[PDB]
Design a protein around this ligand. Structure first.
Ligand code: NAD
Ligand code: NAD
Ligand code: NAD
Ligand code: MG
Ligand code: MG
Lengths: 255, 250, 224, 247
């Protein structure tokens, strides 16, 4: 049983899918269109021989996050994997950064990770097994201007991830944080557009520029690729891979 | 020297912050103190530094857990001192427990002061520093902003958050005469640590984290802050300066 | 696929050689049964990598005997403990010769073909000592940090050409529990198998965009 | 200040090294310069620093590409100046080229100077510093000791090794009144970079501040590291890169 937050879109959907395909029962979560979401839940459950549940908890609130985990154990019988992926973005200079936006990014991008982890650990320890996979970002290791809340939160996730690993040292549980580079999800398309209109160029020229500025390989990372990474971390080969970061950024953090 | 400059140091009524405010005052910087404790002892410290170093020293008891109070502290510093060259975001609290036993109220509190206050203070200071063409933002993080320790999930997450926030601050101000850096201390024997010293007694703990087996002093951190505030550090920005007796090398 | 695991005669290199076998890759052993147990062309080249010529050779020696080169695993390396002042200049150059220079030679001989093919997976076996240090191991830690940095440059030089380069930084393996207690929080050694799977994973097409980085398999070593 | 202390600065006949030796001299420390160049030009610099700062200044043209010469520089320093409090391993060289087009000659050269010299120089100084109860090894690494660039494999490789070596040096000396740290600078407009400028937009790619780092600033940094306020700063890197590594 694997619970993946914000798994109704982009990266989360990729990791949810890739885990289903490994025989794990999935608990979807996130927003968007209800009809399309049910179509995703049913599809995955019938495309792979596994139980797929949907819990639309709003992770911007601790209780709701812990609630998602307790109810996930109550309806699935157990929780093996917790992929804390749900996240949002907002760009502006520090002095123009709305407090409300700062609060929202910290509550979802960082605090949800704490609440989910805190509710999951008790079940994982008692069962002698556990896999906590936090979706941080290259921005959990380096920074970019105008993304203070995001960079702070992502760095927070990396830090919290390490603590989780140390508290669970050898108990059959491991906590890690994938740190993706650009992934052309809706979260990045909004920026591509912003860049496209900023320099009066077309949607595809801005995409290439935004990509070359940070990504050496000049190629976007994929949810499927990220799913493959999440699956590996879930594997037995990664039994001793804990409290670390795994960068899938095509050279972003190398230079 | 820092004559003619104004430094605001949060949580400077004691510990690390007091050593930093003192070191800066000894360089001729005007100072704005902040923090809690005994009001009489705070006034003695405030008047004492002003007299000993011949600088102007004000006190502002803003409760840093409140965003608007943090921004108010910076703005009133500018209104009363005339400018703000150095912002030292040092105030912070701790709490130990397993992630599962970690009180939510404790999580929110650590984050609000240890991380959010750095944001609020920095946001308030930036506009003034950009206009001034000069600026030095010094965030007191910790070795825990680079590595972790069990039972300190909130603290480590916040500290790491500060490190990241510092890098973003540096990038948004790069080339404008402003730098942003995070000093990351190792063990420093102050009230925040003597409390953990006594705790372990009911059950020389440097061997664990600090390879040199020596404590870092408020004075040494004050000297590091004075260095980052100097002109030789004009191109030192968006980075961490570890003062941890080897903590992070191994 | 064709993978050249150096120092794969024993320990970690063996584990990596083994795992790449199970995935259907033609192993090109090295160092000082599997061909049948896995159904692959397993060769042996005892070329001593402590010589840039031997290394640059061991590579091309596979481009002709295997006809192809897809995966290069620079694993071979030695260790010597001694204070910096008491550290033999002989050993220093030895540790740097193999542990670091061999990677640059092997990599220098591999890239030309990988770029031609349009596919490559350079996997260097560094160490936690490529990110952190320990007293009395100045040559190892230095070389390892060196590998780490070299790995990053190899990645930037091959970014977007279908070739990646990463560094696995293993923690305590087995080639006592008080030794673990001090560096490994999990208190459980890392196995060549796990390293094999990791190397396997890094070779996966899922790690296509994973380049110029390090994968710490240390049971928590670097986390604290 | 640094009155009574002796500081050896490798490759200090010009550029960064000279700026560091000059800042240390200004604090009152006796200086041992090292490097190549014109005999009269070097003497002018040597005699000038000594006269201007009121300290003793020796010049040793030892070739640091040789392990014994490097160790000889240090012993000669202790022989002439009577002690060694500060060692700044700064001499270095550069060569750009693809890993495949990279001359093995250049690879081993860059490694012996940029990396082995730090080792040799440090081994020679430690016995003296441990006996003294005080020491400061200041290695001049680079932003490339933490991150990398294309076509500088040997350079990046060497710098990272220095960074790692610095950490071991610190652990092996922890608590003995000795610290070892590595300054990692970004672009400094000197010959090492002027040869690449030919081969305000060169900064634009790596240095956010769009301003070069100066030898004076690196010297001020070496001075801070040698001060007592830095007694507990050891085994770490100090980046002076205008934001290079922040992003
Ligand atoms: N796209 C990138 O370039 C990229 C790469 C590095 C890391 N990241 C991280 O990847 C993760 C996934 O983002 P993505 O790029 O797939 O974006 P996305 O918008 O496509 O997906 C975000 C998901 O979060 C869910 N979500 C938002 N608010 C929520 C709330 N309050 N409660 C519950 N669910 C909520 C959404 O419904 C959605 O399914 C985020 O944590 C993001 O910061 C993004
Ligand atoms: N003590 C150590 O060993 C150590 C290790 C490295 C990093 N740190 C960091 O150093 C900083 C200083 O801590 P310290 O060790 O001097 O502890 P301390 O408790 O002695 O000092 C904390 C200061 O914060 C002020 N403060 C607390 N809450 C406040 C609020 N809401 N509003 C305004 N002021 C408030 C206090 O009045 C006090 O002056 C903290 O950010 C801490 O996390 C400390
Ligand atoms: N300038 C930069 O942009 C930059 C970037 C960060 C790091 N670095 C590092 O700074 C240090 C100094 O570089 P610089 O820019 O001042 O260059 P430089 O060439 O101006 O100075 C190098 C000095 O080293 C001496 N030297 C060269 N080979 C020697 C040998 N074999 N033995 C003894 N001395 C020798 C020279 O005589 C010269 O005085 C190097 O270690 C370099 O890697 C420089
Ligand atoms: Mg460590
Ligand atoms: Mg970088």
């Amino acid at each position: 049983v694997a619970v993946v937050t914000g798994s109704t879109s982009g990266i989360g959907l990729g990791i949810a899918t890739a885990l289903a395909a490994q025989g794990a029962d999935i608990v979807l979560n996130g927003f968007g269109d209800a009809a399309e979401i049910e179509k995703v839940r049913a599809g995955l459950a019938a495309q792979h021989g596994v139980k797929v549940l949907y819990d639309g908890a709003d992770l911007s609130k601790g209780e709701a996050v812990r609630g998602l985990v307790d109810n996930a154990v109550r309806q699935m019988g157990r929780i093996d994997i917790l992929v804390n992926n749900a996240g949002i973005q907002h760009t502006a200079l520090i002095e123009d950064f709305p407090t409300e936006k700062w609060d929202a990014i910290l509550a979802l991008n960082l605090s949800a990770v704490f609440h989910g982890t805190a509710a999951a650990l008790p079940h994982m320890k008692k069962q002698g097994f556990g896999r906590i996979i936090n979706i941080a970002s290259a921005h959990g290791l380096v920074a970019s201007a105008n993304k203070s809340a995001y960079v702070a939160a992502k760095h927070g996730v990396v830090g919290f991830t390490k603590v989780t690993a140390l508290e669970t040292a050898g108990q059959g549980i491991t906590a890690n944080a994938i740190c993706p580079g650009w992934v052309r999800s809706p979260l990045v398309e909004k920026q591509i557009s912003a860049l496209a209109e900023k320099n009066g160029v077309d949607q595809e020229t801005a995409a290439r520029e935004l990509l070359s500025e940070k990504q050496p390989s000049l190629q976007f990372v994929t949810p499927e690729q990220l799913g493959g990474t999440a699956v590996f971390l879930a594997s037995d080969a990664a039994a001793q891979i804990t409290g670390t970061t795994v960068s899938v950024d095509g050279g972003w953090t190398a230079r």
